[PDB]
């Protein structure tokens, strides 16, 4: 199917407690494969998936040099942001970045991404055209004018259309046994009486990859969206994910409810019910 590569940077200032911490992680789809932490005893880009381990010393040295330079850049950006927002040097603030590419089955770029935040709020974003910017406030407009002058969007476009796509395809080939393998959910419905007049039906999905999934309850064929409790999809720890959906039903009407499951690893969407 389609695939993505994404890098996530977090830069966090901490006055009185040394220089800002810089953490970077890299993902292919829902699989983390590298990390960098400036707080580590010996900061380096390090493997987090087995298939990246076959890359040589030139790769790892190159990525480490880049992360160290990046940490320095975002420490400077944190100081700049203080001036843009009239803030003092005493507070702790955070810059976040998230960029990457999506490719389709044929390995061609579907679209690119490069978006930044300040203190958890949108700051600036590269538009889908990869040639212009969306700035969220008057501070980000200052950055936008700088990046327009230095033609930064052109550099990003070159990366998103070139190296990003080429290396993602490389990773997809080296890790094809796992990255190009979907694991379907294992599903069942549980039943727990609340009282004499009500029961909880809970539809479980376990051991699936990737994380994208849809679980819905129907009553008499009608979606019960506003009455369903849906927990956030959660990692199991072995690369796979878990999710459940629950509805409270009148006792004796359990069989009027059906759970519908959609996942990439299933040939067709699944319909299941409580089997007493």
């Amino acid at each position: 199917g389609s695939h993505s590569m994404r890098y996530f940077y977090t830069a966090m200032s901490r006055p009185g407690r040394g220089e800002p911490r810089f953490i970077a992680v890299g993902y292919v789809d829902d699989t983390q494969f590298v990390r960098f932490d400036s707080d580590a005893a010996s900061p380096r880009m390090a493997p987090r998936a087995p298939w990246i381990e076959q890359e040589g010393p030139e790769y790892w040295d190159g990525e480490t040099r880049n992360m160290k330079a990046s940490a320095q850049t975002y420490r400077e950006n944190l100081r700049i942001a203080l001036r843009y927002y009239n803030q003092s040097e005493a507070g702790s603030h955070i810059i976040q970045v998230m960029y990457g590419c999506d490719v389709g089955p044929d390995g061609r770029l579907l679209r690119g991404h490069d978006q930044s935040a300040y203190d958890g709020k949108d700051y600036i974003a590269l538009n889908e055209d990869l040639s212009s910017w969306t700035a969220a406030d008057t501070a980000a407009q200052i950055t936008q004018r700088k990046w327009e002058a230095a033609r930064v969007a052109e550099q990003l476009r070159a990366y998103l259309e070139g190296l990003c796509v080429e290396w993602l395809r490389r990773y997809l080939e080296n890790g094809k046994e796992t990255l190009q393998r979907a694991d379907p959910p294992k599903t069942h419905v549980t039943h727990h009486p609340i009282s004499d007049h009500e029961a909880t039906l809970r539809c479980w999905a376990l051991g699936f990859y990737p994380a994208e999934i849809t679980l819905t309850w129907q009553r008499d064929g009608e979606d019960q969206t506003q009455d369903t409790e849906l927990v956030e999809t959660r990692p199991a720890g072995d690369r796979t994910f878990q999710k459940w959906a629950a509805v409270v039903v009148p006792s004796g009407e359990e069989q009027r409810y059906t759970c519908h499951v959609q996942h990439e690893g299933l040939p067709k969407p699944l319909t299941l019910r409580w089997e007493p």
Partner: peptide
């Protein structure tokens, strides 16, 4: 493979 960051905010 990560992007090279050049220009500041």
């Amino acid at each position: 493979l990560a992007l090279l960051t050049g220009v500041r905010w």
